[PDB]
Design a protein around this ligand. Sequence first.
Ligand SMILES: Nc1nc2c(ncn2[C@@H]2O[C@H](COP(=O)(O)OP(=O)(O)O)[C@@H](O)[C@H]2O)c(=O)[nH]1
Length: 170
Amino acid sequence: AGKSSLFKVILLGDGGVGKSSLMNRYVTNKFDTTIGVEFLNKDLEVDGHFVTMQIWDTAGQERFRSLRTPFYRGSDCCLLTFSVDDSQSFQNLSNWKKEFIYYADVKEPESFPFVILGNKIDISERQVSTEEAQAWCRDNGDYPYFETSAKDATNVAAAFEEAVRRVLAT
Ligand SMILES: Nc1nc2c(ncn2[C@@H]2O[C@H](COP(=O)(O)OP(=O)(O)O)[C@@H](O)[C@H]2O)c(=O)[nH]1
């Protein structure tokens, strides 16, 4: 039978930025306004090869954070997510990157693929400009940056497709 490779992607970011909604939008093409760790699978294709992505949202319960970090290991790409209406969530990207590197024990962090998502761009009143987000991305690893909306689907599939491409580029 036609083989398929399995890529593990993890979503990290502050509560409320839209991680669950992004994954659900990508996999089910629905949005509608979950307590523990959840992961979903999606088939796609890259350069004519079948692949499957397994998307983890490891934001269970904060008092049990120590029990969620074992599930970082084996991640092939990390999608760091903030909301463009929430500057605090943007300011926390660096700390999310650090948590991931530490608890996933990334041995070559300078080469590990990250993708940055600025979600909720359907909201006109922003606290983070496009330019400020792009500058952070350029200056903190030159990661791909997507302005997304789970609510309207803008750039959602593109962001996840890019995650798999970045994995392949190793
Ligand atoms: N306007 C808007 N609201 C969104 C978007 N994505 C998620 N939401 C809402 O923001 C809240 C937090 O979403 P959720 O996916 O639970 O965030 P998580 O805590 O990061 O998993 C919910 O009320 C969502 O409906 C979006 O792209 N646009």
